[PDB]
């Protein structure tokens, strides 16, 4: 994947630019920022069942895709709901820390419209879901990380949508 | 990166990054304003590090600079130094982002391929960057100059 | 599209409640503002050529993309860049006239980046074009209207990034 | 190009070539071999065509190389020499193309809006490719010379 | 601004609304003092146009050498005349409330008329942001702001 | 003021005043009345005068209102009016004192100072300073006049 | 005055001791940020004046301070206010390359505040404008120098109030 | 010179050389060679920084050649680029002395004076010095180029 360092780097090696004062300044918010991050990447990490139980309840749980005929119906599909549920919070989580948004793009952005529409999963339903994962983090995270949380969230349901 | 490459050992075993996995990346975000000037130092002595290692590469090695020899006449030499400078781009590159990765992606991969049809002799390259490494050590100062030595070993070490 | 107004509206109207007095707050913070910028349209709709002008001159022209080779080199490739940086201002003037950002995304937003990719334009150029005509578009307008006009350009810009 | 404009024609008609429009073809690719003479011509006389074209176009226009004026300063005067060798470039390519589609797609089109945004006046611009005309014109044999004319005729033209 | 709402009611093909036609009253009521406005700036007219002409020479030395269009003193008058036009029809714009008349004198075909002239369109956008620099400091600050719209829309039009 | 001037010459010397200096006193306390009316005069007309000045200024100095110039935009034209403004109160204040003391203090001192730091041009204020002259004087009677230009031209030489 | 090499030295001589190791790591900490603190005094000296025009425009013009009855109104106050902030300037850039804050004390500091009182000059806003000159400073040395800096105009402000 | 000012301290004192002043002469004289290099590097592309410099600076300062400016022109043009040619040489002659007082007596004490006097805006000149130094720094050698900034630098500060 790729993360902000790496971003920086890689834009100066495709001008074949040594790296300068103004890259160097991009670097360094960088280094300010991740003390925050890795705080906040050990609360998900410990409230992520939580997380995912409080986000369902708010969307997805208590609806007609629970009801029979309803795409979470069954156990088999529920459980696989929620998988996809820590699946994004995993990469966001991830994404995070990188502070790049590559690495959804990478690995759960690219062809998951394609196979949620052939499996028949309902992706604003999903959005949804995402959304209301954020609100959760962004409450556990507290404001200053919640800021950064809240963009990788964001990312996901843009690309899902 | 130190980061990225934790992120995909994570993402391998899919799972939450660990405790012990996340202490490093605190460690290195503390590291990375040091790692920077070091950087920044190497950039500024940038080109009088490759002016002084290319002469002392072709005083320990005559031939290359030979009728016989590859980096022979005016536009060879010019490219063997234009390499170096490379190389040099490169271990800053490397400095800042605390992994050689970066430096292995553009530099170390496909290297001996790339030379031997060039027919460049390998060796030599190394000798030039072991010679960058001790014009650099002498800007550095001790500990910088040890972190950025590091960097230059991995290099002579790949080719 | 949906503006501030609406937007508390159909809050309310999702809720079926009648609209209260916090309801009736951020109304009156909307209407409060409102003077301002309309002023602030004007002054952005009589320097728009010039807005464009000054920003393509602190990241666009005299660069790569403008040489051959760049992405931006050829007249009707220029033509068209400039086009697009028209078509942002525009965009931005019209949300911070109407107080939300939905119009961005139901106009300018969607599909953008899949644009971009398919033609190789460079959204990172793109990003500091607009980053670039928000900065010009701050002195013009002038503080109070600024911050006002600095969300609408950044959310442009978190969107294409 | 001759070919690719006559292709086009045809594939909105839905139809084969007709046959006026391949004896236009076997027209042109027996001129080509002059074309491209002409052409080269050009290409060896750039530097100079462009530096007197230049001085003719300041001395015609003083304006735009005054304080007020765009051209005005080393930079700015650069980058009007730059696009008058730019137009050159295309004109050669027109030449040996036998068509101005190729001048068009890279030079014409959203011109006006170019300039604009840049502030520079469109007709010192075409005064400048009128005084290359002339050097160009000049320097070619008379049948060559009426040639090269159309393009700059249309460059002109088209600004 | 009456012919506005006219013909907005038209288009619906309804009867003016109650609040359409209080606007109308709202109008009708300041048009007296948007009168007084446009009398003081036809009353400074001349020095207006003068002290803008001066401030585009000096912004613009092109426009007013031997190169550029302004250069000598029957272009210099044609330049200024010019300057006098927009001016004339920035008062009627106020008068009217709308500037719809400003736009069918001066901004419709005025691009194709200039280059056919080959006057800087710039130049000129630039005399009349002169014009309205001057003619704010007549004005008191409301009036100013009032007259600035139409002078904007000039701009904003060139 | 005049008296003030008398009596710091005096503490200086260390004596009381002389017959001279009583003199000149009298002659002040005699001339105030017609002082009185020249600053009234001014004060009436100060809103004409500055526009007046300020007009004629920019004429005179195209630059100054210019996107390179200081005073360019209204924000800065109306701060340069303002400027305009306080020099001519200065100069009321003076007439009636008698003496340029009230204005000295006031604006004169570290002027060039606060003009460098500002970058305005100082010899475009004195140009302004000049020009509010002209059209005062213009109002005033001649002799009512002279006494005015004493105290304009002051300004103007103390800002070069 | 007292400078960090001289602080050490003359912690070391009351005690009697010779220079030890620990001392001398001390020092060294010194050489290293030497080089950066001449590079960012040089800077200063040549900004000055900007440096004070900015960072008045920022806080002390434009006020009530300088509308008649407030105390910078008159040259004279004005003239003087500017003076000061110079003083504040050369001194904190003193104090920078010194490495040791001892010597704002004993010129700057000492008496200051008395003597504002006297003045009637008021205080805080004194404060604001070493504040803003701060932040002027602290984008023209870059960030790394910005700090050593930041540390002195601070020191100079928490004197003072 | 380094020199000039060591002695200049010590006499002051009444004292002999102290070893830290000294030491710092010992320095000078090593340093020496290398500047003489930088100077001379200068002096060769002198013309052509001049020029670079003078319009450089037009560009950012339109109004100085305007009809109202100082410096519009041919004659009042040549002046200008004379002075940049003059503060040049100065510069030179400090990069050798390894301090600023030769560039000090000659061009910086009275400046302010001279130039009021003139009309001609101080400001704009130091750009014109900003501007020579930016030229002069791309044909340095980077540690060459902060060793001529020092100088430039300096010039800058004192015209303003
Ligand atoms: C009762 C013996 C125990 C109990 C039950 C309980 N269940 C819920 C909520 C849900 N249970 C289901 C289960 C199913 N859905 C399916 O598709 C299948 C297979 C066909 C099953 C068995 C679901 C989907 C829900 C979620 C809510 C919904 O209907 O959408 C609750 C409440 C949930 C909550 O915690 O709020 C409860 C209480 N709880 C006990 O303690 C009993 C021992
Ligand atoms: C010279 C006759 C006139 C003149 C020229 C002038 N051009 C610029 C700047 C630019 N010129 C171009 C134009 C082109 N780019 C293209 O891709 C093509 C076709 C291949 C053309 C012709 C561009 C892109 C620029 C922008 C800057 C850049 O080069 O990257 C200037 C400077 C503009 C400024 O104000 O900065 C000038 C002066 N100006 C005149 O008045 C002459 C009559
Ligand atoms: C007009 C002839 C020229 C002009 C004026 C101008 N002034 C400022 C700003 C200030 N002017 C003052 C002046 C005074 N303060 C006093 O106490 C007195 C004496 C009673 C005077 C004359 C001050 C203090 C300021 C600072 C702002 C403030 O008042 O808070 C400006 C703008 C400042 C700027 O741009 O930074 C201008 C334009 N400038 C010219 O060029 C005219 C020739």
Request: hydrophobic share 40%.
């Amino acid at each position: 994947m790729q993360d902000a360092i790496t971003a920086v780097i890689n834009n100066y090696d495709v001008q074949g630019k040594y790296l300068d004062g103004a890259a160097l300044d991009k670097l360094k918010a960088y280094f300010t920022t991740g003390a925050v991050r890795v705080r906040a990447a050990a609360v998900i990490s410990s409230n992520a069942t939580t997380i995912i139980k409080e986000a369902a309840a708010k969307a997805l749980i208590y609806s007609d895709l629970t009801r029979p005929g309803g795409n979470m119906y069954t156990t088999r599909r529920y459980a696989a709901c929620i998988r996809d549920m820590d699946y994004f919070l995993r990469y966001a989580t991830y994404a995070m820390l990188a502070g790049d948004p590559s690495i959804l793009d990478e690995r759960v952005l690219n062809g998951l419209k394609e196979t949620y529409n052939s499996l028949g999963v309902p992706i604003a339903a999903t959005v949804g879901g995402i959304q209301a994962m954020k609100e959760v983090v962004g409450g556990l995270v507290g404001p200053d990380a919640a800021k950064e949380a809240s963009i990788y969230f964001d990312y996901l349901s843009s690309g899902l949508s | 990166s130190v980061l990225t490459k934790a992120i995909v050992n994570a993402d391998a075993e899919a799972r939450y990054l660990s405790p012990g996995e996340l202490d490093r990346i605190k460690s290195f975000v503390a590291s990375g304003e040091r790692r920077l000037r070091i950087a920044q130092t190497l950039t500024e002595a940038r080109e009088r590090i490759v002016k002084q290692a290319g002469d002392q590469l072709f005083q320990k090695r005559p031939d290359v600079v030979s009728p016989g020899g590859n980096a022979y006449g005016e536009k060879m030499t010019a490219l063997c130094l234009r390499d170096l400078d490379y190389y040099l781009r490169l271990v800053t590159y490397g400095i800042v982002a605390g992994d050689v990765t970066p430096i292995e992606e553009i530099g170390i991969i496909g290297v001996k391929e790339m030379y031997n049809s060039l027919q460049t002799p390998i060796p030599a390259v190394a000798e030039g960057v072991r010679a960058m490494k001790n014009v650099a050590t002498s800007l550095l100062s001790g500990d910088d100059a040890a972190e950025a030595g590091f960097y230059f070993d991995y290099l002579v070490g790949a080719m």
